[model samples]
Target chain A: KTVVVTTILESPYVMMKKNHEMLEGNERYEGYCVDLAAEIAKHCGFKYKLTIVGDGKYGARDADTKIWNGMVGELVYGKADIAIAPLTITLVREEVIDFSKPFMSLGISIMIKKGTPIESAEDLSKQTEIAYGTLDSGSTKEFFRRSKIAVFDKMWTYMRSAEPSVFVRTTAEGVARVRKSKGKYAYLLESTMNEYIEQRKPCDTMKVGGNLDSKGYGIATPKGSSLGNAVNLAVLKLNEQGLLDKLKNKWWYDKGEC
Target chain B: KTVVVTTILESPYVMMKKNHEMLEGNERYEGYCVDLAAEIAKHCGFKYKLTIVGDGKYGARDADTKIWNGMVGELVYGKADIAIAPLTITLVREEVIDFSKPFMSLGISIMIKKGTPIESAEDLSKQTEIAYGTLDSGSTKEFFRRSKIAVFDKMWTYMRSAEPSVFVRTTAEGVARVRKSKGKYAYLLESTMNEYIEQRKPCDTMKVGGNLDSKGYGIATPKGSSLGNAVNLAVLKLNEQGLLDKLKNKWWYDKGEC
Candidate 1:
């Protein structure tokens, strides 16, 4: 069977090429995960088709129905055989999906416009002068929802009740809000995305302070899939050979503009 | 038996009070670790006395003699019963002494005089305009000396051979040199000390960039010392009850002048 790979269209992970209109089939996209998917399929002896998650979300569960949505839902319903993007390996997700050992390591980090007064999460929570937020339907948002750490739980309470809706629908929207909020707004997202943006043009944003927590991204497969074992071994082989580190540098650092 | 605590006289950790001329034994000194020692002793049911380390070094194992110096040496030699200071938990030291789970987390941070062009270690490492050094005999120094990360190892190479002996004998001297260098020098030290010093008067020195590395400080005891379990528990109890946070604020912020 041709494995259907589900991914979100997040920059540097799964973005369209400059002339995507001129390309055909798998050649239409290029990115860290795009390249990663090719490598994994080659090693696992599977032919795969790349499909962007229709909802354009990382994934989350409905509070009332408990049904997964976004790429996770697609995988749950057998619409996709795997997710090959920056999908975080969260506890809730792990209940129904089996994730290969992390292919990338990251953590939730604070992002600030160039002159924000905030220096740490403690600084962010102590006062209301500046507002902060995370992407909706993602691990960064879920972290706050489930946090027992006093500062994090406090910030979660604040974000949940903040006026005008503090949560953004996507990382791009969150980054855009931070750019235009005139230092009054901060965005909390994966360190990978924050660092990638900081290196792009109009480099007025910065990842401030240390990460609030540490986690990683894994190649996810539906529960009990035979491919899970193969993918896990592939990730480990890539990591042991230092190919994972090499790929990160190639995608994140080599083309960095700032 | 009374526990003998070996610590260094670093500002905010240990300092001679303004009225030291009139104060007695324990009263002669006051600061973060002074209060911390009292609390740890209180919880662990031991009477304790604070004695400053003779050399004022944090700790280092001399290559030629294989002798540990500074507070670590004091513990290794049984000259002190416990060490209550910002002693970093490192692999080399752990081989000889036991450390409680960190009472405080810190990382190697860069201290720059305000208005420096450098914003990150990459920028500093790529330039020759500003000279950077860590304290001569501490974990911060050893971090650069032992790093395997390419950028950090590269920095170690540059700092190890920089002319005129870049390392300083004390954090005070390092900060003083930074203030007087007129942006020509940057001092690398633990983030806790860097942030604390940034809040003091003449706050011209600022912590620039994210940390070069992350580690933590623990109250240390000699290997197999009976006090190890109790001291570790005390640190945890204080940490869980929020006393650690309160004490940090009492010293670093409540006393902050700038």
Candidate 2:
């Protein structure tokens, strides 16, 4: 039986190579997260097929916007058996879908153009001098909005309520905004992405300060899915063996420029 | 029978007041750690004498230096009956002394003067511009020096080789160095100290990032100390109640400042 796994095609995670149509699942989706999901499925006694989330958005219950993206909707709409992307397991999301214990740890961080004066999150939160934004409604944006640490907690209130509040539709757009603003704007996102971007060639952006809160991205499943525990254990085992780092380097480090 | 409980005299844990003679042993130490220790002792049906460590260091084995501080030694040397300070339980120490199951959860953290370019432990490992030091032989320093991660593995070589490369006589000295260096120097210590310093007045220093790894602090006694089981149970009871946090707030927050 094929376990329909949902993911997203992002650089370092997935890409259409020059010689298309002939690669194994293990090689085609070779990033840390993709390989991890495959190992987990194997340990859990399940065979699976990967389907990239048609849209990149992580899904939303829009009263007015009325748009949905990411496999969050697939699980909500019962279209996929599991989500294998680097999907953050948030409190709100946990209310609807079942998420396994985290397979990876990440935190909300901000990226600014190198040589920018902004040194810490506190600096950004204390003054409205620099404009900032994030991938709309995703974990990065939501973390800044819900953080409890002093400067961030207050900044979150403002960002959530500001008339034209921190703006962006995707992580790429946020990065683009930071680049064009000449160090006047910062993009908030996961430290993982921020670090990867910092290492890239046109690496004009650098991560700033410490994370606001600790979080994990888990293998998400439809609520009451039977595959939760076995799959979660497989992830934990992989983490302990340091396989996550192995796969991460295999794709993000040695493969190509992220 | 009276229990000789050894601890360190840091702000809020234990301090000499303007009128030293006015305070009793238990009253002389009245912060979160002290209060929790008292409660644990009480719950375990034991009476303990609060005594401070003669040397200021956390506890280490030094053949050249020829100095031992903190109750980890006292327990091993049979000077103190048991220890209730924020002493960590590591395998090295565990081999010499028996420790109860953890009474507190903590990890090693880095303290930098408010702002610096380095944000994560990895960044600290990768860079050489900012002079970073650890509390000499303590676990915080050991974790990185022993890490398999490329950055940390490289950092260990640097820390171990730098002449006057690292200065770590005591935890107090490390804190003073971080404050005096004007953010140029960073000191890595335990998270308990990191958070305790956070609640301190003016919050002169801030905990920059989440700890590198997680571990627990267990009340320790010598292998022959019959009090191990009792002390362990006492710790569990105190943790189950709200007493631990209450004591920590009362002691650590109310009195950490100079």
Candidate 3:
């Protein structure tokens, strides 16, 4: 059976090639995750199909409806056989689905337009002159929402009640705000994305401060999925072989613009 | 029921307090893992007893006898209920045991006496004047044994057959070798331990270059242990609360003598 892999469209992870319209199927998409998915399938000895999560969100359950959404929902609802994306491994997620050993480590980080005075999360929290926010419906947002650390809790309070709604629906939206806001705004995101953007053209953004919290991204599958163990081992093997590091370098730095 | 926690005696993770001989039970130990054990049990709502592994090894399955040894063996043989130490999360271990999500991320790093010419693994690999080796019966040693990377594979070949039998039985011995080798020998160890040693009295050791590989230390339990899930969630909770970082700073830097 062909594995139905659910993913999201995100730069350097999953993105359309410039000539994507002229291409078809797997060739239509290329990025870190696209290559990763192929490697994973080869190692696990499986045929697979890549499908973008319909909602374009990573994964989160609605507090009111008690229903999961995004790639996680696709897996839980049996719409996808697996998910290969930058989905974070967390306690709540682990309870509902299985995740492979982490393929990449990251932390919630601050992204500032070059020349912005922000040096750390503490600096961001100490003043309101420069507005900041995280990607909506994702771990970055949840980190702030769930954090009890005094500085982070304070920032969450300001963000949730900000006049124009500081949260952005997508990473692109967040980055664009930082790029165009002319130092008036900062985007809170995972260090992986923040660093990737820092190396791209129009490199007016910089990642400031140590990560607020550390975590890793994993390939996720529904609870008790038969493929879970195989995929998890594949990840570990790939890591030991340095293939994961190779892939990151291929997509992140080898293709650097700045 | 009291959880029987088995750990190793490693500085900054598990160590005897200055007045340990005068203390009793858990109070005899006070370090990062010691404190972490207390917090994990409190959050998981369990009473626990801390016991040092009798073998003083992290773990490895004997090749000839097919027997597991060290803290891992203690778990597999039901000698201990759980292991809360600087145990690495690896593929082989995962097959016979369970591990919580990593409580700390680290990598195999190079340690040299201060003012050494080495700066990267490649630098060490290219020269013969500076010899290097890893701790025995541990993940760092296993990393080289299983590595297919050209540099690491080459290093492993040299180490396995080196004159004077470069491998050390413990991390302390490894550090002492580097400190006294007068720049003639470098030690390969986890970055966490390397960094800890770099800040100690004499301050004659330095960790140089990027890590050879990235991984994390996790709490380990025997496969199918009932306490696995709770301890796993507890690790995530403590990490999110910033307790992990706090504990690291407390044990690594706050007590620095240099």
Candidate 4:
């Protein structure tokens, strides 16, 4: 059976090719994850189809309804055979899905407009003049919501109560806000995304401060999925072979504009 | 029922207490893993007993006999109910036993006598004046054995054929060679252990260079073990609560003598 892979349409991970409208199937998309999916499929000896997640959210559980949404929901509901994307491996998610060993490592980070004068999360937390937020329905938001660290807790409190709803629907929207807000907005995001944006054409943003926390992105499948074992070992083999690093350089730095 | 936890006697992870001779059972041992075991047991609501692995090795499968040894063997053979030491999460090990999400992140790092000229793995790989080796029957050794990276592969070639048998039976032995070899020998081991030793009283050694590869130490249990799920969640909770970082600082930094 052909594998149905669920992934997000995030920049540098999975993005529409210039001629995508004229193309059909996998040829319509290209990015780091596109390459990764191909490699994984080849390594595991499986034919697969990549499908963009329907909701455009990474994944999150609604407290009120107790339903998982986005890529995670696709797996839990058996709509996809596997999720090959920048989905985070979290305690709650691991309960319902199995994640291969992390194929990429990242941490929560701060992205600010160039010359914003904000050097750290603490700086953002201490001031109200400049506002900051994270991608809605994602690990970045959940981290702050669940954090017990005093600074992060304070930031979360301010973010959740901000007058204009600081959170954005997507990472692109958050990045755009940082670029256009005249240094008044900062975006909290995964370092991998923040770093990728820092190298893009506009070059109006920079990632500042050490990462707030450490984590990784793993290919996910529903709990007890038969394919989990082979996929997990394939990821480790790729990492050991240095293909993951090579892919990162190809996508992030080799094509960098700045 | 009490969980039979098997761990190795690695310093700062598991160690005999100063008054070990006068103590009985778990009281005779003290270190970071001991503290962690207590926390996990409390959170998971299980009684437990700590027992040192019969073999001092960390765990590896013999190439000839195909027999697993050390704490991993203890888990595979049902000699222990769980392993709470610094056992690394790796592909081979994961195939036989289950690992929780990494409790601590680390990488293979370099240890050199103070004032050594080496600053990176590349430096070590390029020169032969100083010899280097990893702890035998461990992930460090297996890493080199399985590596295909050009520089690492070259280093492995030299190490496997080095005169006087450069490989050490233990991390302590590796560190001792580095300290006493007067800059003629370097040790390759986990960054966590290397950093810990750098802060010790006889602080004549330091960790040099970025890590060769990134990985984590995980709590281990036999495949499909019942306690796996709860222990995994407990680890993630502890990490989210910042207790893992707290424990690291308390054990590695708070008690530093140098």
- Of the candidates shown, which would achieve the greatest TM-score relative to the real structure? 3
i-RMSD values for every candidate model: 9.8, 10.2, 1.2, 1.5
How well does candidate 3 match the true structure in TM-score terms? Answer: 0.97
Once fitted onto the true fold, the runs of candidate 2 whose alpha carbons sit more than 4 angstroms away are A16-18, A21-28, A63-69, A147-150, A157-166, A251-258, B1-258
Alpha carbon deviation, residue B91, candidate 4 (Å): 1.3
Q: In angstroms, give how far residue B145 of model 3 lies from its true place.
A: 1.8
Which has the higher DockQ value, candidate number 2 or candidate number 4?
4
Better of 1 and 4 by lDDT: 4
> Which candidate gets the maximum DockQ versus the true structure?
3
Query: In candidate 3, what are the lDDT values of residues B83-176, reduced to their tens digit?
Result: 9999999988988999888999999999999999999988888989999888977999999998888988988989999989899999999999
Model 3 accuracy (lDDT, Cα): 0.92
Q: How would you class the docking of model 3?
A: medium
Candidate 2, residue A84: the lDDT equals: 85
**Tens-digit lDDT track for model 3 on A66-125?**
999999999999999999999999878888999888999999989999999989988998
Model 1, range A1-258, lDDT digits (tens) per residue?
A: 889999988988989999989798789999999889998888898898999999888778898998889898988888899999999866567768877656776778999999999899999999998988989778778778877779988999999999989998989899999999999999999999999999998999999988666556888888888897678768755654456766788888897898
Expressed as tens digits, the lDDT of each residue in B60-98 for candidate 4 is 888799999999999998999999999888888888999
lDDT tens digits, residues A1-258, model 4? 999999999989999999989799999999989999999999999999999899987888888999989999999999999999999988889889999878888899999999998999899999999999999778889999999899999999999999899999999899999999999999999999999999998888999999898877999999889999899999877877778888988999998898
lDDT by residue (tens digit), candidate 1, B1-258: 878889989989999999999988789999999999999889889897889999888888899999989999999999999999998876667668877656776678989999999898998889888998988888777777766677877888999999998899889889999999999999888999999999988889899888665456888999999997677667756754557778888999999989
DockQ leaderboard ranking: 3, 4, 2, 1
Q: Indicate the docking level reached by candidate 1.
A: incorrect
Better of 1 and 3 by TM-score: 3
